[PDB]
Amino acid sequence: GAMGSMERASLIQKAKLAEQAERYEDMAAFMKGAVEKGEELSCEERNLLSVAYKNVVGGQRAAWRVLSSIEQKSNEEGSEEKGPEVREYREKVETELQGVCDTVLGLLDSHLIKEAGDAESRVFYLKMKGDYYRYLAEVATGDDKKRIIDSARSAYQEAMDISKKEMPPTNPIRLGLALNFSVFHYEIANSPEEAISLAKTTFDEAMADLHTLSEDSYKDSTLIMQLLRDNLTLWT
């Protein structure tokens, strides 16, 4: 690995610099190098890893949607056939996206999840696993779409089970997990009623616990609660 010769602390420092520079491919490579040092990650370091790869895969998802739309249009009655290039380039971007997802899933499997024993770290990583299987599901069409969806579901479910046992209903990790699992239900699993029920129950249980929070924690929780509300408004 090209980061093998760099100090862990230097990789984290440069990840933060890359973030400031909006150089998210670099930021992800630095954080991959930091993970591969083999030590567990702090909460700030877990967040750097997530921010980096979410930005990288986010650009790929956006590009893939543009290209898939063009391809779908090209494949309709009355469309002048224009050769293999749209499909080829959509496939190129898709393969790069799947590669990023596989890299993240690899870091989680080797060995972030198995070393994560505290609820805050373990739920964070299992949510990430669900998220990157969900991004794989977004582009899956062959035999394995069903198995990819089930892998996402399983990871989210393990994360949910832990979060409900170990975290208050306002906890931001728990809230964002529920948000993303509800997105999985609506957008991937063809289960909009489950998505709505999860978002509603999550919102209501958090509302009832807000009185326990400081001003700063109240701000964190209500920001994510607003996203649940936004989706419920979209979905209903």
Binding site: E187, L227, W235
Partner: peptide, 10 residues
């Protein structure tokens, strides 16, 4: 319009 997932928080 696609559903909103958890955003980045720097």
């Amino acid at each position: 319009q696609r559903s909103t997932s958890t955003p980045n928080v720097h």
